[PDB]
């Protein structure tokens, strides 16, 4: 995942001009938790894997 | 009364009534007892709330 305030390709001649450049949605999550779990501090079962819509 | 006819008196003292007497009642109940508040099954339930 890779943040940027420019309307610029990642291969585009401007950007780095490697790799290909997607579109990403959401900020990135550290994999260990996904928030919202017990309203008193107890954890839901978050969820994990990479791609994995869920 | 029986309605018994008298042999030479008249019982005039004795009447049957035709309506009802409203009166002044003293007070009643006071309120309602204790209600139960919120839901005991729910208390402690997880809720999931993280976001995309």
Known sequence: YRIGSYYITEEDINPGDSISLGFGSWAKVTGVIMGTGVVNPDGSVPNAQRVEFQ | ?52
């Open chain 2, 1 to 52: 009364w029986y309605s018994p006819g008298g042999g030479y008196s008249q019982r005039t003292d004795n009447d049957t009534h035709t309506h009802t007497i409203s009166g002044s009642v003293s007070l009643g109940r006071d309120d309602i007892s204790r209600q139960p508040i919120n839901t005991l099954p729910p208390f402690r339930a997880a809720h999931i709330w993280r976001r995309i």
